[PDB]
């Protein structure tokens, strides 16, 4: 989700 996604713009 946009939470699982928002955890991969924190990295990227």
Partner 1 sequence: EEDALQMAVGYFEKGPIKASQNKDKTLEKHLKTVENVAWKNGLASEEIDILLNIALSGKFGNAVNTRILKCMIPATVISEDSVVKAVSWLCVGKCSGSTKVLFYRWLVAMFDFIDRKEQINLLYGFFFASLQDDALCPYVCHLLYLLTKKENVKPFRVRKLLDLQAKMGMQPHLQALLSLYKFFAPALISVIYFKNSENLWKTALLAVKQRNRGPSVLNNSLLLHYINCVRDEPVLLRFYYWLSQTLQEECIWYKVNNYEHGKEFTNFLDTIIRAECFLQEGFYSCEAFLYKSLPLWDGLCCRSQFLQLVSWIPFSSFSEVKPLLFDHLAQLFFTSTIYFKCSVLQSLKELLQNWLLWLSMDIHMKLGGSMNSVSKLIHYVGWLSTTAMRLESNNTFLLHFILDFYEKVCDIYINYNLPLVVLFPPGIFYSALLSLDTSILNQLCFIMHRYRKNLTAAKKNENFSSKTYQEFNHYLTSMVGCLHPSFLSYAVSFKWSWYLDYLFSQGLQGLKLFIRS
| Site residues, partner 1 (CB under 8 A) | 1-4, 6-7, 9-10
Coil vs helix vs strand at 1 = coil
Place of tokens 């990227």: 12
At closest approach, how far in Å is the CB of 7 from partner 1?
A: 5
At closest approach, how far in Å is the CB of 6 from partner 1?
A: 5
Place of tokens 């924190």: 10
Distance (Å, whole) CA 12 – CA 5: 10
At closest approach, how far in Å is the CB of 1 from partner 1?
A: 7
């Amino acid at each position: 989700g946009v939470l699982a996604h928002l955890e991969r713009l924190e990295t990227q």
